[PDB]
Design a protein around this ligand. Structure first.
Ligand SMILES: Cc1cn([C@H]2C[C@H](O)[C@@H](COP(=O)(O)OP(=O)(O)OP(=O)(O)O)O2)c(=O)[nH]c1=O
Ligand SMILES: [Mg+2]
Ligand SMILES: [Zn+2]
Ligand SMILES: [Zn+2]
Length: 898
DNA sequence: CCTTAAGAGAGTCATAGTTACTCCCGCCGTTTACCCGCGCTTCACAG
DNA sequence: TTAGATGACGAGGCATTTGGCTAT
RNA sequence: GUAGAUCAGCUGAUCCAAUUUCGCGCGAUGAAAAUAGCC
DNA sequence: CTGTGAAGCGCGGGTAAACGGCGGGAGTAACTATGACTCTCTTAAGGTAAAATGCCTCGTCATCTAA
């Protein structure tokens, strides 16, 4: 009977019809959920403004009544009868005297050229090449010097005519070590980014880095004595960098200005001193030593959660400043720093630095005539964020005192992160005076609010029906210009986190398009693995941790990533799941599993939120959403981790190590953990290996060669022809039989042995040993034949080479090969007599034991690194030789089928 | 020279868990549209 | 007062690494 | 016909292959700074 | 023409008769969480090796004890 007015579905009850109308038809139900406004309760934010206006009029005029207060409050939204009936109350008549007391004081050649570009760029700058592969292109400057200059030159040349701070905002803001000389240990402690381009002056980073520290100290102290630097070091070049991934004009670029490396080093030391000297307002979570993005997103999510759950009025604006650094006036900044109580030498230094600012614009290696700069704060100077924080402190100070949203008895008034601002309010009135305060003190400094991006979210609930409701009509102004309303279904991005009206939602991501782009770039197969490992997956980590995501979507994302890796390395689908995700030291390929990694990072970031210095974040930690999220994160972390033996923390690495070493194909890789030199071929030395050979090593490493036993997984209902050896050995045809046991593969085993013997012998000859290869020694047990014997300084060593299977202990195999020579006794005397030395104690047995998958025996590695002086870059090549010998064995076994 | 190794993950479908609301009924507290005047203003009225 | 033994600190030589990502 | 190989119908497409182009073995392919945070 | 008295108007104390915030109470649409199942399933050769920072090792110097 009950039928929906918007989709005509039929329901059993009015209850289910209402629950349907809430979820399936949001805007229509938000229209029906609108409260009436006949007898609205007086929020205290309205009460404070009415009381303070009445108090200032009792000071200013002496005597007044409600008929004047209706005139003094135009946009207040109360009738004169309401004003009278509020005015007759006793807490208001207390607050009026309380305020009065204070106030009365071709196609083919193009791809060959693209290969030539990509392979050079991958070696010059790997991160740039990876960003080029993922996005599609780079080098985003798409305008001429004229089109850049005719827009940007009247902006830079104009002096900002802002009148500077007013004494009201200075009084609101008001609620010695600096310019001492710089020491040597201060220069040593203050780390610097030496991977940097030089300025127009042309002194490179290594040229300044070679200068000794005490001479740099006396040049810095000399420049502090003058109050200026040499003028050739003070000049700047500007390169325009795009703000949007497809810029539509010169206004969508930013003027990043680069000066000399000594200026940036000196200003970085002064920047760390200035950051230690004057901390900003506690609501400014930007350019300080705290994880402010976590804090701002957590507080905003908690406020938006409690707003819906407890049915309270909640008015939220998101604000931005247009061209924030590029518009600050020299006058307002320098006199604010003077009235902040900074030393006069520092203020004179900043005034003389920005007085003499001249810049050359450079667009695609075409340079402009020099530009005189009238608006301050260079994008690219170390002192510039710390100076912009001083500007933001005035704006944060000028907010009204008790306007905000009270979450867990903390009155959250504002959240700041550089120029980004979120304002919170209880009523329309409190937000409107907050916007007027922010706008006014912004215009005092030369800043203008970004009207393209400023927007307001506004919730007014219904009592007596218990309905949440969001406004749709535009109700707030900057200077008369109406602000935009965020609708109930609108989705917006805050600090790289996706938000809606109910809080955090799932981050919008482009995994499949990026995996398509990597799959088509002209790359070697290991380069695709490195771009996936180091560059693609850490992009979406931030929004997955700070946002909200389910286990299902993470699980499908891991399925997509594993399918991409299985396409690139030509792996079958029954490769163990832990091999993609276990570490390189453990024998895995170290592609991060998003399902396992993201709860671990949510625990490790959000668990520290209780220990924050900021009280608002500690209030947010008590909120219901973050508590529920942290319980889910702890449950999923306990599902996909093992407790580490030493530090007792949960770890994802031991979970993947246990699952890899427990699996059938990964079982032989269990000793790779003890010897990190065995797997340097996977990631460190992969560029020294051809792309065919790398994929053949990957197939050799986790047994993925199509032998008749692994090929017949699930299909072993057939006869012995589906299981036994192709060469007729009448045994079960494993891959290890083909590589290690088959009569067809005997000469390849001999060649692999002789190659490893020759390489070890050449390395021992470089390490000054007197190597004799293959002694035919006739001891009384029979003809015995060690691989190599050698002498150095009277000490003798016998070395023998093994390439073995991993279903036994490798160290046991080393000892079993060792004791054949070391416990022979008489043969040691034959070795000593051949080397010309009498003492049998000075002759030591040693073995060179490595698996056919390229895993070193640990004790044999210690013998070859300690008894013999072989360096470990020699020892990193023996796994490559064993792996390539194994795949040559596999290739010859498949060729000889005839 | 070498001394057999040996299923596993993605997709389907049914049921359970839970989240985010619904509508119904009663009660006190709050709000303000009016009732009821007192002090000043304006035309009748005294001089 | 001088000589020998022990402990601490500094210098020299050799070997290993030389990141990535997000916000503004 | 392709740097080389291969599949199609002299051209396209795909590779485990793939340093083009400009210049005299060898140089250049010309990006990009700052402050925090996280791994 | 000029200042005061009856009627008019604004400016304030008071009431009451609705709103509206909320407790208690019974419900459910429509999303993810678990589990038991089912489905699906590999091959192109050949003989192979510059610079900066941090850690490790060795030497030199200083202090304490004994003669
Ligand atoms: C993104 C970014 C910002 N900044 C600084 C410069 C900006 O003035 C300040 C705030 O950044 P933005 O607000 O992102 O940049 P903007 O204000 O100049 O651009 P818009 O007008 O579109 O808002 O942070 C950098 O120095 N480097 C950067 O990469
Ligand atoms: Mg901005
Ligand atoms: Zn409907
Ligand atoms: Zn065989």
């Amino acid at each position: 009977g009950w039928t929906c007015q918007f989709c005509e579905r039929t329901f059993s009850t009015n209850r289910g019809l209402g629950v349907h109308k809430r979820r399936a038809h949001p805007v229509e139900t938000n229209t029906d959920a609108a409260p009436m406004m006949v007898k609205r309760r007086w929020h205290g934010e309205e009460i404070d403004l009415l009381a303070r206006t009445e108090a200032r009029l009792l000071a200013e005029r002496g005597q007044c009544s409600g008929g004047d207060l209706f005139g003094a409050l135009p946009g207040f939204g109360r009738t004169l009868e309401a004003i009278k009936g509020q005015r007759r109350r006793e807490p208001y008549r207390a607050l009026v005297q309380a305020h009065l007391a204070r106030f009365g004081s071709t196609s083919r050649q193009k791809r060959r050229a693209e290969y030539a570009r990509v392979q050079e760029l991958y070696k010059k700058c790997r991160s740039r090449a990876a960003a080029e592969v993922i996005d599609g292109a780079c080098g985003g400057v798409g305008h001429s010097l004229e089109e850049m200059e005719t827009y940007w030159r009247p902006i830079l040349e104009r002096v900002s005519d802002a009148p500077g701070p007013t004494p009201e905002a200075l009084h609101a803001l008001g609620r010695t070590q600096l310019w001492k000389p710089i020491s040597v240990e201060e220069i040593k402690a203050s780390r610097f980014d030496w991977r940097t381009s030089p300025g127009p002056d042309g002194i490179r980073s290594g040229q300044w880095r070679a200068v000794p520290v005490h001479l740099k100290a006396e040049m810095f102290n000399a420049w502090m004595a003058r109050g200026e630097i040499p003028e050739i070091l003070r000049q700047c070049r500007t390169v325009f960098v795009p703000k949007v991934e497809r810029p539509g004009g010169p206004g969508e670029y930013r003027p990043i200005s680069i000066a000399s490396i000594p200026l940036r080093h000196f200003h970085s030391i002064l920047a760390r001193r200035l950051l230690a000297c004057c901390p900003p307002d506690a609501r400014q979570r930007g350019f300080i030593c705290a994880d402010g993005t976590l804090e701002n997103s957590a507080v905003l999510d908690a406020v938006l959660g409690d707003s819906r759950k407890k049915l309270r009025e909640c008015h939220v604006a998101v604000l931005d400043f247009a061209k924030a650094f590029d518009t600050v006036s020299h006058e307002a900044l320098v006199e604010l720093l003077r009235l902040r109580g900074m030393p006069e030498q520092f203020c004179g230094y900043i005034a003389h630095l920005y007085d003499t600012a001249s810049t050359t614009l450079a667009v695609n290696n075409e340079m402009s005539s020099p530009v005189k700069v009238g608006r301050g704060v260079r994008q690219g100077d170390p002192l510039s964020p710390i100076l912009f924080n001083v500007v933001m402190d005035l704006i944060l100070a000028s907010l009204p005192e008790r306007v905000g949203y009270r979450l867990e008895m903390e009155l959250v008034s504002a959240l700041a992160y550089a120029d980004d601002l979120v304002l919170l309010a209880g009523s329309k009135v409190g937000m409107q005076e907050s916007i007027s305060a922010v706008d006014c003190v912004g215009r005092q400094m030369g800043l203008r609010l970004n009207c393209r991006k400023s927007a307001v979210l506004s919730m007014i609930p219904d009592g007596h029906r218990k309905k949440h409701h969001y406004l749709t009509e535009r109700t707030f102004n900057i200077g008369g210009k109406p602000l935009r309303q965020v609708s109930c279904v609108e989705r917006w991005r805050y600090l790289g986190v996706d938000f809606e009206a109910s809080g955090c939602v799932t981050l919008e991501h482009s995994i499949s398009s990026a995996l398509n782009n990597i799959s088509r770039a002209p790359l070697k197969p290991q380069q695709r693995l490195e771009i996936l490992r180091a560059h693609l997956i850490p992009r979406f980590q931030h929004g997955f941790v700070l946002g909200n995501i389910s286990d299902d979507r993470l699980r499908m994302l891991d399925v997509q990533i594993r399918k991409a890796v299985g396409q690139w390395l030509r792996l079958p689908a029954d490769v163990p799941k832990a091999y993609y995700h276990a570490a390189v030291q453990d024998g895995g390929l170290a592609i991060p599993s998003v399902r396992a990694t993201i709860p671990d990072l949510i625990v490790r970031r959000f668990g520290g939120l209780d220990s924050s210095p900021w009280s608002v974040a500690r209030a947010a930690a008590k909120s219901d959403k973050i508590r529920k999220k942290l319980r889910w994160a702890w449950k999923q972390l306990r599902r996909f981790s093992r407790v580490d033996s030493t530090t007792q923390r949960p770890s994802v690495r031991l979970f993947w190590r246990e699952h890899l070493h427990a699996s059938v194909d990964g079982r032989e890789l269990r000793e790779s953990t003890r010897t990190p030199t065995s797997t340097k071929w996977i990631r460190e030395r992969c560029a020294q290996i051809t792309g065919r050979d790398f994929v053949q090593f990957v197939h050799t490493h986790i047994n993925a060669l199509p032998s008749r036993i692994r090929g017949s997984r699930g299909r072993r209902g057939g006869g012995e022809s589906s299981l036994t050896c192709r060469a007729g050995c009448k045994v079960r045809e494993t891959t290890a039989h083909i590589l290690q046991q088959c009569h067809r593969t005997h000469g390849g085993r001999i060649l692999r042995h002789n190659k490893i013997v020759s390489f070890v012998a050449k390395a021992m000859e470089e390490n000054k040993w007197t190597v004799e290869l293959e002694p035919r020694l006739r001891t009384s047990v029979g003809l015995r034949k060690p691989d190599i014997i050698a002498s150095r300084d009277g000490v003798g060593v016998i070395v023998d080479v093994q390439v073995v299977s991993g279903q036994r202990s490798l160290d046991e195999l080393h000892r079993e090969k060792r004791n054949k020579y070391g416990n022979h006794g008489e043969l040691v005397e034959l070795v000593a007599g051949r080397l010309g030395l009498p003492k049998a104690e000075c002759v030591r047995a040693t073995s060179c034991t490595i698996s056919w998958r390229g895993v070193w025996s640990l004790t044999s590695y210690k013998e070859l690194r300690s008894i013999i002086g072989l360096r470990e870059p020699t020892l990193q090549i023996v796994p490559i030789l064993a792996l390539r010998g194994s795949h040559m064995n596999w290739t010859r076994f498949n060729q000889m089928t005839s």
